[PDB]
Design a protein around this nucleic acid. Structure first.
Length: 94
DNA sequence: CTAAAAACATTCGTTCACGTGAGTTCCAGTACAAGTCTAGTC
């Protein structure tokens, strides 16, 4: 719902990072075991980037839908963090 | 020549000064993670 609690939590995240909110929202609404390998995720991200550079959003939506439906809550959280490019783990690049 | 007094020798308990080993805990240093780096218009 547009006015539902989940929508308000997702949109109003004080622009507790967005990844945690998405994980909490999707925890009772997604599967428990995914089936997407690293190669498939890389291919989907490559398609998303190539389509963004080509100014096409329908296929981006399709790829995101596939990722959402073929992933669990933790996988979705990590994918969101990767897309935002803010993967924090306590260990630096070095 | 003998007795009294002074001096010396050894032992014992106590206190003080230092040195040295061992066990426990605190702390100052060092390593690392993360954020920031100018401000605006179109």
């Amino acid at each position: 719902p547009r006015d539902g609690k989940d929508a308000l939590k997702l949109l109003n995240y004080r622009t507790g990072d967005f990844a945690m909110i998405a994980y909490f929202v999707l925890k009772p609404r997604c599967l428990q075991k995914g089936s997407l390998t690293i190669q498939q995720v890389n291919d989907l991200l490559d398609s998303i980037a190539s389509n963004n550079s080509a100014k096409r959003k329908d296929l981006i939506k399709k790829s995101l839908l596939q990722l959402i439906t073929q992933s669990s809550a933790l996988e979705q959280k990590w994918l969101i963090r990767m897309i935002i490019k803010d993967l924090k783990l306590g260990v630096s690049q070095q």
